[PDB]
Symmetry: D3
Subunit: 253 residues, 6 copies
């Protein structure tokens, strides 16, 4: 077997990828999302009740479908990053990255020694298909995609420095965390927040990195796509489930 | 503690109850449905990948919310009915009931000896809250609601006989199974099928039983409600999740 | 490896075995019970929310301890009996046995062909330790113990006939089901019920079979032990947990 | 989406398919087996500790790989067959089939009304991908493959009658159950048993049905492949795991 | 929907709340505890085998009952505190707090930006009921209760400084950890340890904070209640289960 | 009950112990490994998809068998070490130890106060069997075995310093991580790497500590045993499962 090609990683340079957030924390719900045809699915280990084992179940469900899996760990924890890479997550989204030094450490966390600090356990890893991918330890690093989130004032205060880090493939703006950080909690739609988001997208793309964002607002999502934003999540499974069931009940009250 | 009042059962005689089918087979997904405000939730043990333990988890999630839980077992199996009653399911929907004899056995399956054949295990049962409901063995039978499905030609061939069974609280029409039985598989909307459904509803209510049905078609659901149908399920969580995610992706393709 | 010796089975002829009912349906709770020193633990697949997989977890927990595991299936279902024997349950308690014909079928369900109808899958079974017990298919039948429950009027109406079945090692009286059957639901303590239980124990022992019963009442349990009852369960984990926590709260209200 | 093509079913007429038995009852272990390159994987719900939910997890793991999933239910139970088809099992192996009447009922259990008795729940089923396979109710029946086991004297006594049942795609011989039935428990290698197996294979193929068998014996398996046997399982994951670990330890003792 | 009112938090100023430690790590066992009528239940993520997903299951069980849930994480880990708040834990007990600086960081960990560092993910959170609590991001902070444990010499060495931290609602004394720290491991009953505990309680209440403690000793628990201790846990489910089963067996030996 | 004797720990001074790596992350697979007769089983929480709860299930499976359980946490995290000791892991293997300061902290993480920093929760711990081991808090420390991994240049740069730490019972060499660290990723067999491993083993044994290693290469493993290496893992369950299935398929292709 040859290593799984990371099409998400390649498509950062060639197209705009439409994403769905997956917080239902369940292999069965993840498979339903995998059938729709999203370019990427975000398995949320930060804000949904997920652990390594539930994330593995969702990777296994999604793997039969063309949608590319991206995993958000709860934090930029080097040992957790090791665990998520070994279960075979090829794209990681690190929350709350605030410095070049942190971004460099996240790069190393995703690469084998001697260049990085990724723990070696190829005989045990779904990532190597338990060494059925015979050249995994040579071919792994190339199909790993590192995304970091800028979603705090300190993040914005270190944006130029993070954008200068070789090995950061993309910067994702988190509007919920960023609008709260800016003193507009629950109101990312405010012009003060939006002007910062647009300037941030422009600076990310100007530095040759992929820009990413989530908006459940169709107008904002289409505006971000018009700016050339490379990876745009357009909804959340928990949100769509709740809203679809409420909208239906409202017809009958 | 006093036994949990079965409001679904009482409301069969006082109002029209709006239902949501729950086939996501997950305590977390069931809790999302429970927040919406449906009169009843159908935990599907027949057509969703559920067992006694996953059904228990969903009952525990839903229990904090006003929505009344109804459980469909895979078949009219007396031992399985015993298991679902002891985990505290107070309303059962029995699929594919086809005779007065089978309906009578389902009545007995829901009632303690000597009048019924429900196995006695109150010290172990969530139903009795492990005997914290001190008079459970005396008060149980009154808060148990038996619904049976007519969804085959043999069912329709025995409808008057089933409607004469004391202890059957409601007859639910399954349009998917019934339309397939009638040689219109996937096409319940056909006049031939609809005329049989309307006459069946009329006969059920004429005999003093509650009538029920599921349609994801808003016009059909509102038509069934105009006929006085007592319990109408208006959607399915798997369907709404899939449809909401597809409709969203179609705005971006 | 040699087959696990069924000490419960042997001790039916040599001593009185004190039992604990295990309905917490959890490998961790079962291990707590296993540390106490009961002669036997009843893993209840009839009245606790258990399935083959949760019963396997509890067998694995209990296996490191001297307490002997007995499993109650939800009913006398031949295929379920096959499944519980293969995960390595060596003693079964069949509920609601009502005839010699049913008891004979339960005997066959526990024995390999050509004498019985137990399905053969030794390469897959924890029971054979995946054939690490090299002579399992020759030594299995001898360490299997069959117990049947008499707990209905029809059971009592066929008692002499069931006691004449070779391969029934013990008859267990279920006071909850039997008192309900007799029209004293929730009141097995009534003299009418107790006189039948005592006569039933005497007849079981007179026929050379082991007699068994459960009573959470210390006086009744000691009375049954004074009659020579061979296997007596003296409590239920769910009951003891609820009562211990209520008794403690009552000191502080 | 178009219905998943059942290549196992097609290949019954065009080649000899090599199989691996999957009794580790685990989505993670099933994925390891899926990477090897077997033509088919048997998810054993009869002799391994599986239920609908653990079988679903293994179907989801295997689905990303070319290996074709076959599911063995614990018995020819119509409602369980319904449950396994809806989670998306396209080939079923029914144990201990003993008459044309039973084989005919298993055919009906796999087909939608009005021709069969398969319960209709396409909105809830992974099988239809929750109706994302838009024509599922019209295209389902064609991609369903029914295999029945002859593994008892009564099965052999009804072989010609079973082979005359339209809708039985294949007859699998179970050497463990059959050798036990014949009074050679644990010793299927005996000439008495082998002569019956060879004649049975010849009779199956003469009637235009696919023949199947399992043997962990390389010589027997190759002899069966030489006879033209269409589906041959050549090992068992539990057996291979145990033997590989034993053989390794023996080098160091 | 309005945010769940934290009655535990309000009752810190109005009454003495009686608690039960829940370490059986199981939604089913947590529901048994929830039926008893304790003012609060401690779901132990530090010393019972719990993770975010098992803690979620226990919150869902308890939510139908008046008992207030408190969650102890394994340590004062900011990302884990984020995870436990989003699954809807409204009161946290932080183990081994040893400085004002650590206590201040725990305050921030429980509050949204810009005032705190709690990660924002309201669309995914059971805490917000997936935004069905429409003003959650404005009303959340007020119903969150922070408790910290003083249970080391360094804790006692920084007690006045911790008691001066705005946002610490209560200080809980851990007698097991504290007695071990003081060189009296397993012997918290010693006068040396008790005099420190009493003075510590007096200082906590003198600073206007709620004091808390656990003792399975009825006399010590009643002494702590006589001192005005606001939240007193009086037992542990694992302890009561083990003790109740041992005491019962001792009557029969 | 008396504390479980750590025979692995005793045997570090008296014999050479043969080990099997357990990465199938499953109570059922762990039991299969436990039946083989390995001196020790490594439950891998670093490179297999395990958490505290799945590790507990595997400890419970293994506990009925003579094989000694060793647990590798994902990192030298003090709170995780606390959690793994309380579920009853008596031997820990800490990955990537790189200084005497870190080794000293790992020693303290395994010992109760006042000498160590292990959190006290004996009432809740399987380790104390919920205090059924009456003297646990006095006898615990003696049956705990600390192993540390040297598998980086910084580890080798601090080897003499680590070997001088009282309370480190053994140093395990990780050839995968070490060969990668040395710029021979995937090629530990190279003479440059092997000469370092041999000198490292000699230095470990010269300092009076137990030396450990894993090699799936029979020749290398036997060479290490010839050097006097005290604990040698000779294979990996995931590797043996994959290879056994591949080698079998290759006979039929
Ligand atoms: O927006 C953010 O802050 C995020 O990083 C995650 C959110 O959960 C996501 O955008 C959904 O609103
Ligand atoms: O319609 C039926 O046949 C049913 O009984 C159940 C179906 O799954 C339900 O109606 C959803 O279409
Ligand atoms: O008493 C019975 O009827 C039983 O067979 C089972 C009961 O659950 C048990 O005795 C506990 O009351
Ligand atoms: O051989 C049989 O009887 C079977 O049907 C199943 C067995 O488990 C299989 O052949 C493995 O020995
Ligand atoms: O006492 C302590 O140290 C605690 O913080 C927790 C203990 O597990 C609890 O008190 C039970 O003894
Ligand atoms: O070798 C190492 O680096 C290890 O520490 C763990 C590996 O997973 C093990 O050796 C199997 O190759
Ligand atoms: Ca199950
Ligand atoms: Ca987990
Ligand atoms: Zn964010
Ligand atoms: Zn139906
Ligand atoms: Zn009974
Ligand atoms: Zn068979
Ligand atoms: Zn403590
Ligand atoms: Zn390593």
């Amino acid at each position: 077997m040859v290593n799984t090609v990371n099409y998400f990683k390649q498509k950062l340079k060639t197209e705009q990828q439409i994403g769905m957030w997956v917080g239902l924390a369940d292999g069965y719900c993840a498979e339903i999302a995998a059938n729709v045809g999203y370019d990427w699915l975000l398995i949320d280990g930060e804000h949904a009740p997920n652990d390594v084992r539930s994330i593995l179940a969702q990777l296994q469900s999604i793997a039969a479908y063309p949608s590319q899996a991206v995993v958000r760990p709860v934090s930029g924890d080097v040992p957790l990053i090791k665990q998520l890479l070994d279960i075979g997550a090829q794209t990681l989204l690190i929350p709350m990255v605030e410095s070049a030094e942190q971004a460099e450490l996240m790069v190393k966390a995703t690469r084998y020694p001697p260049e990085g600090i990724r723990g070696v356990g190829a005989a045990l890893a779904r990532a190597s298909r338990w060494n059925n991918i015979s050249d995994y330890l040579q071919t792994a690093d190339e199909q790993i995609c590192l995304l970091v989130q800028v979603e705090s004032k300190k993040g914005l205060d270190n944006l130029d420095e993070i954008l200068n880090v070789d090995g950061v493939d993309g910067i994702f703006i988190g509007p919920a965390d960023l609008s709260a950080a800016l003193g507009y909690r629950g109101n990312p739609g405010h012009e003060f927040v939006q002007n910062i988001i647009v300037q941030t997208i422009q600076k990310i793309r100007a530095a040759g990195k992929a820009a990413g964002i989530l908006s459940a607002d169709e107008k904002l999502a289409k505006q971000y796509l018009e700016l050339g934003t490379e990876f745009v999540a357009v909804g959340v499974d928990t949100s769509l489930l709740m809203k679809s069931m409420k909208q239906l009940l409202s017809k009958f009250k």
